[PDB]
Design a protein around this ligand. Structure first.
Ligand SMILES: CC[C@](C)(O)C#Cc1cc2c(cn1)cnn2-c1ccnc(N)n1
Length: 290
């Protein structure tokens, strides 16, 4: 879409593409007013998708919370809509690729899991589901105060599950899924309305992939095939080389439906007890700091 050295609205000079192909394209850009590098996400106003407006709404509702990028600006024209946000470092999928065996140490995996769980709690606390939890949607900070912090990205698939009063809206009988196949829960595969527990299913799949390097359905492209494996796969065997406490995490989320609030502290305890058991210190160096 936007070429290099294109200047959005005479302020944001495109430098490179850093991601795209989903509901949007995101660029690293130079903010010519502040002279600071920023992230610039663009959506064609001609796409079927019309999401960036709610990305900003979610983004400003989470402003100030940890693991959330700062909103810098947004705008629209006849060709595309855009949002400008704080630039973060490399994403967790990139970092996992660049590890020699495609795996993180358990020290990194468990401490990442704690941070991602916190950000999932955060967006759930403002009444929104993420619905596209995956490694490429999390990135480490890029500043001296943020580089050991994980940042939640891409609210383009987010949906409000509460209403104005804090009550939970009824789920639809069916809901289309337009997210990423690899880390979707079986509920998502079955076009069921996603709930808070489905964001946690994605976290569970992420952490298994981090520690083990792969998921059984890694190569499989056909979505509707992928759901069939997950529906038939015995998930306890994913935990062969995970800490034993992950059985509690698996058992809990497998028990949930759309209507039941997750026991977030149970999952947090699984991570924290796993770390204490291996003597993993919170301030230990991450794998890529090595
Ligand atoms: C988070 C709010 C919003 C507007 O919904 C979004 C988004 C978004 C950001 C994305 C990507 C996809 N979507 C891919 N990379 N990336 C990066 C990479 C480096 N820094 C930053 N800030 N974002």
């Amino acid at each position: 879409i936007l070429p290099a050295n294109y200047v959005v609205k005479d302020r944001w000079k495109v430098l490179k593409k850093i991601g795209g192909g989903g509901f949007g394209e995101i660029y690293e850009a130079m903010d010519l007013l502040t002279r600071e590098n920023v992230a610039l996400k663009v959506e064609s106003a001609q796409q079927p998708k019309q999401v960036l407006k709610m990305e900003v709404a979610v983004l400003k509702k989470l402003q100030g919370k940890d693991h959330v990028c700062r909103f810098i600006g947004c705008g629209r024209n006849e060709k595309f809509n855009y949002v400008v946000m704080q630039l973060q470092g490399r994403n967790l999928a990139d970092l996992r690729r660049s590890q020699p065996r495609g795996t993180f140490t358990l020290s990194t995996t468990l401490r990442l899991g704690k941070q991602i769980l916190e950000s999932i709690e955060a967006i759930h606390s403002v009444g929104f589901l993420h619905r596209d939890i995956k490694p490429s949607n999390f990135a480490m900070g890029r500043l001296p105060s943020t580089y050991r912090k994980c940042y939640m990205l891409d609210f383009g698939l987010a949906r409000q599950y509460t209403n104005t009063t804090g009550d939970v809206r009824p789920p639809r009988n069916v809901a289309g899924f337009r997210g990423t196949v690899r880390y979707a829960s079986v509920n998502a595969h079955k076009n069921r309305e996603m709930g808070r527990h489905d964001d946690l299913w994605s976290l569970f799949y992420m952490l298994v992939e981090f520690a083990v390097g792969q998921l059984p359905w890694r190569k499989i492209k056909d979505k509707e095939q992928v759901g069939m494996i997950k529906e038939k796969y015995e998930h306890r065997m994913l935990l062969k080389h995970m800490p034993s406490e992950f059985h509690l995490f698996l058992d809990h989320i497998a028990s949930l439906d759309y209507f039941t609030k997750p026991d977030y502290q149970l999952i947090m305890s699984v991570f924290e007890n796993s770390m204490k058991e291996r003597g993993i210190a919170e301030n230990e160096a991450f794998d890529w700091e090595k």
